[PDB]
Design a protein around this ligand. Structure first.
Ligand SMILES: *[C@@H]1O[C@H](CO)[C@@H](O[C@@H]2O[C@H](CO)[C@@H](O)[C@H](O)[C@H]2NC(C)=O)[C@H](O)[C@H]1NC(C)=O
Ligand SMILES: *[C@@H]1O[C@H](CO)[C@@H](O[C@@H]2O[C@H](CO)[C@@H](O)[C@H](O)[C@H]2NC(C)=O)[C@H](O)[C@H]1NC(C)=O
Ligand SMILES: *[C@@H]1O[C@H](CO)[C@@H](O[C@@H]2O[C@H](CO)[C@@H](O)[C@H](O)[C@H]2NC(C)=O)[C@H](O)[C@H]1NC(C)=O
Ligand SMILES: *[C@@H]1O[C@H](CO)[C@@H](O)[C@H](O)[C@H]1NC(C)=O
Ligand SMILES: *[C@@H]1O[C@H](CO)[C@@H](O)[C@H](O)[C@H]1NC(C)=O
Ligand SMILES: *[C@@H]1O[C@H](CO)[C@@H](O)[C@H](O)[C@H]1NC(C)=O
Ligand SMILES: *[C@@H]1O[C@H](CO)[C@@H](O)[C@H](O)[C@H]1NC(C)=O
Ligand SMILES: *[C@@H]1O[C@H](CO)[C@@H](O)[C@H](O)[C@H]1NC(C)=O
Ligand SMILES: *[C@@H]1O[C@H](CO)[C@@H](O)[C@H](O)[C@H]1NC(C)=O
Ligand SMILES: *[C@@H]1O[C@H](CO)[C@@H](O)[C@H](O)[C@H]1NC(C)=O
Ligand SMILES: *[C@@H]1O[C@H](CO)[C@@H](O)[C@H](O)[C@H]1NC(C)=O
Lengths: 322, 427, 97, 265, 49, 49
């Protein structure tokens, strides 16, 4: 408050201190929001006790996994899907750095977020769903896919004689998903929307300094060179009331947006717990069709789920009896 | 513990204050002009003007001493709708206009922008928004004479209300409209331009007043009226308390690669403040930016355990700013925390008093950018290790082997969920 | 969900396989005691997806084919209870090529 | 014709770079009609009433296309006589004088010569009888000329005259590109000086002389006929223009908020 | 119809501050109610699915 | 804002616009609320193809 409302003027600070404890509340609200955001990232991503590493030999019964497994050739150990997601979200700027609107860095940087997603992918590709309940128990990937087939109703022998066709369909879908992300202009609408909303809120708060709020001038230091302090303090109070109201409006809008983001992060954590760590029988929860298994993918200010589902096709009608 | 208003502080990181660097100089850049402004010729005349036709005198390119005003025409009111009585000798003025005229005894306060009537609509009109002041004093004998000086002619009425700062040197034959007339006769063709005039012993309210307004303006062109000039030499790489033609600000002066046009003077940004200014002399464009900015956060293990603390300077390069103390300029003070221990450069900011060991543990105090802090040994001090995500594991995967548990464990955990808080009612 | 019944949602009523839950009264809230089933002491074996006996493929009804290194058994997934491979444990579908 | 995209200037003398700042000061509306006002003056001794009276509806935009020094000065007044102090501008070869004073009738010398008098002289004395005249602006002339090569090279001059709380302002810039009928070239317009007289103006007049009248047609037809006849005169209206600056700090483009609903978006 | 504009503008400022505060209170109450309605609608969509 | 706070008075709107962008925020918040209600209805009901 003492640096946004008052441009490093001691008389304005003495007038602002007279208003009382109005500004410790805003700082405590912003610190609570930051702690809540760090907690949100921690509960969505940090769910596995141990980091699992995939074996160097990447054969899983014919299933291609190069699009979602991390690439050691890149400077950041990220999948091509994660790289394309990071290149499709974009985060003067010095004005918010000059009137006190600082931006704190997150506790979990993108490298360890990618490491968490890599550990989750290795666990769900090697141990099946057993690593989400206790110790990781290894299992061949065709057998795990057969049991995920058995979980939806169809017996395992269908996979055991259609393994090549199913692997080719999975590879085709996971290859088409990148071009689907690239061609769609509004695919990452929410992740662009959150950063755009934050940028617009910060820009509005910076731009609100130019208003006069009933005073003769908007610049604070021009007031002292033209008026006696009995009326300069009146104009200062007139500016302080409007600036404090603008700050309060920004804080309560940020609180509402933080509550919405917290609800979205709780939903994302539930989806990570259910669709990824196991198999979910909830209809239309992990994608359209009968859910088999899911893939977590890191993203700027969010997470992306790759839901692999079972869609029946080529139906024929017969005659039945009870 | 002053910020939390307590004596015992729990273990954590707390925003306490903000690192701010004060400047050391107060250089002034008043324009180079040594002339004297003409108020003596403005005020010491014999006959000033009439009310409808007031003189307009431009005051420019001179040093104005606003202190010596009461020695010419005392008992004023000064009626300042704008710059303060004691503040006109501080900032530069682009143009000062001295308009003097006479009005009797009743509209010396009706010259205000709010008041209107038979004078503000038919004589000197002040605009609704206006900066400037007016001086009025007694004229009971020095401007009364025998049966008046007869220079009291006022416009009375006209067809349309005149714009502010506008005069009309013309006569009218106003009628209000019935059988339109141009003759001198009074009936239905009433003549404007009445006046006053009397022996100095009269009915009190008609005794005249010489009113001399003084309208000023700022910004605009390069300034001409400057007041007392206290020009000081320049420094272009350090923070100063500069004074450029009226504005006062704290920031580091800096040379510019700007493309200021010759008529352009000031440089603004997305906010109302000004980031570029033109000096009155040498015509050099200089950029304005403040000094080191970022806040400071204190990391403590809690007063129940220890008393050592580690501070973090948010958003500033550690190898360049702090380090050099330069005491009696830092508002947060406590400048002892600059070389007490070793430093580290974090994306969160410069960390003072924490030694970076490069082991990995589940971290205790979240600092930011993947780096946490704790109170451990390598002897008990504050360390700044990198966050550990957990135990590194590698379960062996092969396409012919499975793992089946031969035992189990009945484990009971707890989960705590809030349901309802306190209910409150206010009157 | 976790108290009035048994939940199949993973990690919704505690880490592991959920069995039941207990409500506990707390000031300004509630406390759950999540009883879970956590496996331990795993032993790895050699597994096969199917077994060809007489030119036909055999798949287990419930369970997974397991081996002790010499012969083959069938057992359930979350516990090691080996059994002789019979026609009751498995079902036949298609050829073994 | 229609003033397509001209008439934008700097509302304040403040350097802004890559800002989308808005304003409130009055401008010339986009895609608005103007006047041609062609002057023939064939040196035959006749008159065609080519200098009419304009009502001066709060500001006038003046756009001219001449060769070097054909136009000279403008007359501003309420009654066009010595009853009020009327503003007078006279342009010299190496000077300009801008002065307001109670002048009755602006004179015009004997001007009947086209091609025989190649060297232009025996001129001026336009000013009326002297009276209580105010402070003038003896200074450097603002009109400049570039040597035209291979034809089609003349400079168009855009002038904006306005009065805010009595204060008198001038905006002028020269664009040496082409000789057409108000081309779509977007460019800013720079104020030069502020005139502090603070008098009222209700009528507008100009003082063009046509000693050199080369390729100047004449027609009395009145109607919507676009063409670069002699010059252009526009009218200012209170608008809400939005201006865009660039990295170098020049007004590249500007729109208003009252012309089109797309402009309002 | 009653006051001079230098103090009429003070009275307008007094009215405008209260009216703008009332509008801001209305819009933040509507934001909170819309967040609750969004949560209820998400629950309804989950029950539909 | 200019129609609710001020009863179509011109200089009331002149003093209103001096307060800054305190009303574009309210307008964008209310439009976001309306868009969110439409999104809620679409998400609940439009789930079949
Ligand atoms: C999984 O798919 C990817 C791409 O569909 C394969 O990557 C290709 O590898 C070959 C040779 O290894 C290269 O010539 C191609 O240029 C690669 N494709 C691209 C798009 O770069 C990858 O080999 C597949 N994995 C397996 C095990 O076959
Ligand atoms: C079931 O659907 C799959 C998917 O289309 C069919 O597989 C395709 O068959 C055609 C015809 O032989 C091939 O050209 C395609 O290359 C196959 N696709 C893949 C991904 O392998 C399959 O044939 C269908 N089953 C039956 C019995 O017709
Ligand atoms: C796997 O389990 C089987 C059955 O529990 C065991 O094999 C037995 O080994 C003993 C030792 O000679 C024999 O006497 C039994 O006849 C065997 N039983 C069967 C069914 O084969 C043994 O524990 C394991 N078999 C191995 C390691 O080959
Ligand atoms: C299957 O459905 C089609 C229409 O969709 C119908 O014409 C056909 O008779 C049906 N087949 C049988 C065997 O009933
Ligand atoms: C006023 O200032 C400089 C230095 O004080 C002086 O030498 C010069 O005469 C003046 N400069 C200008 C630009 O008027
Ligand atoms: C301080 O620590 C002691 C144990 O060393 C224990 O009483 C408690 O954790 C703390 N007590 C207070 C009063 O802070
Ligand atoms: C020092 O840190 C600041 C803070 O972002 C940065 O702008 C600057 O480029 C850094 N300088 C060097 C030399 O690293
Ligand atoms: C030791 O700490 C430094 C800190 O800069 C780090 O770069 C280095 O990687 C650490 N050593 C190991 C083995 O991790
Ligand atoms: C099993 O995996 C190995 C790689 O470890 C591979 O070479 C082999 O083809 C796979 N399939 C078998 C043995 O049937
Ligand atoms: C079981 O796993 C361990 C290591 O996890 C390995 O050494 C051992 O050979 C495995 N046993 C079999 C039968 O594959
Ligand atoms: C800006 O000015 C520089 C002068 O060096 C010039 O090179 C550049 O083209 C200009 N850019 C624009 C957009 O006018």
């Amino acid at each position: 408050c003492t640096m946004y409302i008052c441009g490093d003027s001691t008389e304005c600070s003495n007038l602002l201190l007279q208003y009382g404890s109005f500004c410790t509340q805003l700082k405590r609200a912003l610190t609570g929001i930051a702690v809540e955001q760090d907690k949100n990232t921690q509960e969505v991503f940090a769910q596995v006790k141990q980091i699992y590493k995939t074996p160097p030999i990447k054969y899983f019964g014919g299933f291609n996994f190069s699009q979602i497994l991390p690439d050691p050739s890149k400077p950041s150990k990220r999948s091509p899907i994660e790289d394309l997601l990071f290149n499709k979200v974009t985060l003067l700027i010095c004005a918010q750095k000059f009137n006190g609107l600082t931006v704190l860095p997150p506790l979990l940087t993108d490298e360890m977020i990618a490491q968490y997603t890599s550990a989750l992918l290795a666990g769900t590709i090697t141990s099946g769903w057993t690593f989400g309940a206790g110790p990781a128990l290894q299992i061949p990937f065709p057998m795990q896919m057969a049991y995920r087939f058995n979980g939806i109703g169809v017996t395992q022998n269908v996979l055991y004689e259609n393994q090549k066709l199913i692997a080719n369909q999975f590879n085709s879908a996971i290859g088409k998903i990148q071009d689907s992300l690239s061609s769609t202009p509004s695919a990452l609408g929410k992740l662009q929307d959150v950063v755009n909303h934050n940028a617009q809120a910060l820009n509005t708060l910076v731009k609100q300094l130019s208003s006069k709020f009933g005073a003769i001038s908007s610049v604070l230091n021009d007031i002292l060179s033209r008026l006696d302090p009995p009326e300069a303090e009146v104009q200062i109070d007139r500016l302080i009331t409007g600036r404090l109201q603008s700050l309060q409006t920004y804080v309560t809008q940020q609180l509402i947006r933080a509550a919405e983001i917290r609800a979205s992060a709780n939903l994302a954590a539930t989806k990570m717990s259910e669709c990824v760590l196991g198999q979910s029988k909830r209809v239309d929860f992990c994608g359209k069709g009968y859910h088999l298994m899911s893939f977590p993918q890191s993203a700027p200010h969010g997470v992306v789920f790759l839901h692999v589902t079972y869609v029946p096709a080529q139906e024929k009608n017969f005659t039945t009896a009870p | 513990k002053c910020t939390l208003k307590s004596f015992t502080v729990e273990k954590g990181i707390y925003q306490t204050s903000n690192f701010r660097v004060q400047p050391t100089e107060s250089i002034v850049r008043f324009p180079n002009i040594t002339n004297l402004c003409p108020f003596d010729e403005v005020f010491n005349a014999t006959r000033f003007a009439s009310v409808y036709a007031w003189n307009r005198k431009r005051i420019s390119n001179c040093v104005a001493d606003y202190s010596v005003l009461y020695n010419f025409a005392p008992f004023f009111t000064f009626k300042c709708y704008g710059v303060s009585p004691t503040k006109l000798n501080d900032l530069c003025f682009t143009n000062v206009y001295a308009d003097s005229f006479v009005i009797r005894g009743n509209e010396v306060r009706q010259i205000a922008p709010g008041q209107t009537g038979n004078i503000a609509d038919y004589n000197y009109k002040l605009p609704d928004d206006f900066t400037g002041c007016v001086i009025a004093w007694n004229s009971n004998k020095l401007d009364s004479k025998v049966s008046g000086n007869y220079n009291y002619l006022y416009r009375l009425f006209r067809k349309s209300n005149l714009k502010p700062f506008e005069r009309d040197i013309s006569t009218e034959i106003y009628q209000a409209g019935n059988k339109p007339c141009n003759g001198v006769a009074g009936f239905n063709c009433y003549f404007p331009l009445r006046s006053y005039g009397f022996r100095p012993t009269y009915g009190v309210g008609h005794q005249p007043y010489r009113v001399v307004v003084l309208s000023f303006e700022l910004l605009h062109a390069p300034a001409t009226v400057c007041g007392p000039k206290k020009s000081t030499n320049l420094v272009k790489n350090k923070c100063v308390n500069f004074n450029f033609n009226g504005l006062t600000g704290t920031g580091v002066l800096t040379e510019s690669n700007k493309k200021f046009l010759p008529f352009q003077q000031f440089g603004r940004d997305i906010a109302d403040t000004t980031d570029a200014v033109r000096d009155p002399q040498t015509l050099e464009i200089l950029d304005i930016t403040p000094c080191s900015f970022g806040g400071v956060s204190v990391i403590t293990p809690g007063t129940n355990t220890s008393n050592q603390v580690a501070v973090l300077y948010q958003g500033v390069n550690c190898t360049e700013v702090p380090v050099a103390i330069h005491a009696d300029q830092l508002t947060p003070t406590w400048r002892v925390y600059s070389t007490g221990s070793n430093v580290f450069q974090t994306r969160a900011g410069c960390l003072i008093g924490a030694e970076y060991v490069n082991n990995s543990y589940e971290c205790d105090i979240p600092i930011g950018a993947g780096i946490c802090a704790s109170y451990q040994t390598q002897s008990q001090s504050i360390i700044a290790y990198t966050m550990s995500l957990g135990a590194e594991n590698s379960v062996a995967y092969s396409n012919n082997s499975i793992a089946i548990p031969t035992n189990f464990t009945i484990s009971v955990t707890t989960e705590i969920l809030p349901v309802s808080m306190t209910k409150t009612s206010v009157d | 969900e976790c108290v009035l019944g048994q939940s199949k949602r993973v990690d919704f009523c505690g880490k592991g396989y959920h069995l039941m839950s207990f409500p506990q009264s707390a000031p300004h809230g509630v406390v759950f005691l999540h009883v879970t089933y956590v496996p331990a002491q795993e032993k790895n074996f050699t597994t096969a997806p199917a077994i060809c006996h007489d030119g036909k493929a055999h798949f287990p009804r419930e369970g997974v084919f397991v081996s002790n290194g010499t012969h083959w058994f069938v057992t359930q997934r979350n516990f090691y209870e080996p059994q002789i491979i019979t026609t009751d444990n498995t079902f036949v579908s298609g050829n073994c090529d | 014709t229609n003033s397509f995209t001209r008439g934008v200037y700097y509302p304040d003398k403040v350097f802004r770079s890559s800002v989308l700042h808005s304003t409130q000061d009055l401008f010339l509306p986009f895609f608005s009609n103007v006047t041609w006002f062609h002057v023939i003056s064939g040196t035959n001794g006749t008159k065609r009433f080519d200098n009419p009276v304009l009502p001066f509806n709060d500001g006038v935009y003046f756009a001219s296309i001449e060769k070097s020094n054909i136009i000279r000065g403008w007359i501003f007044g309420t009654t066009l006589d010595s009853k009020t102090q009327s503003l007078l501008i006279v342009n010299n070869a190496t000077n300009v004088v801008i002065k307001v004073c109670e002048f009755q009738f602006c004179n015009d010398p004997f001007l009947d010569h086209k091609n025989n008098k190649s060297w232009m002289e025996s001129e001026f004395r336009v000013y009326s009888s002297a009276n209580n005249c105010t402070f003038e602006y003896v200074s450097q002339p603002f009109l400049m000329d570039l040597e035209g090569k291979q034809g089609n090279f003349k400079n168009l001059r855009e002038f904006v005259f306005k009065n805010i709380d009595g204060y008198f302002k001038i905006y002028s810039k020269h664009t040496p590109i082409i000789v057409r009928d108000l081309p779509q070239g977007f460019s800013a317009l720079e104020p030069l000086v502020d005139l502090p007289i603070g008098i009222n103006i209700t009528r507008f007049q100009t003082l063009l002389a046509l000693h050199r009248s080369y390729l100047t047609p004449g027609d009395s037809s009145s109607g919507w006929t676009a063409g670069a006849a002699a010059y252009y005169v526009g009218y200012l209206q209170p608008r809400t223009f939005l201006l865009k600056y660039n990295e170098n700090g020049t007004i590249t483009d500007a729109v208003d908020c009252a012309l089109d609903p797309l402009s309002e978006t």
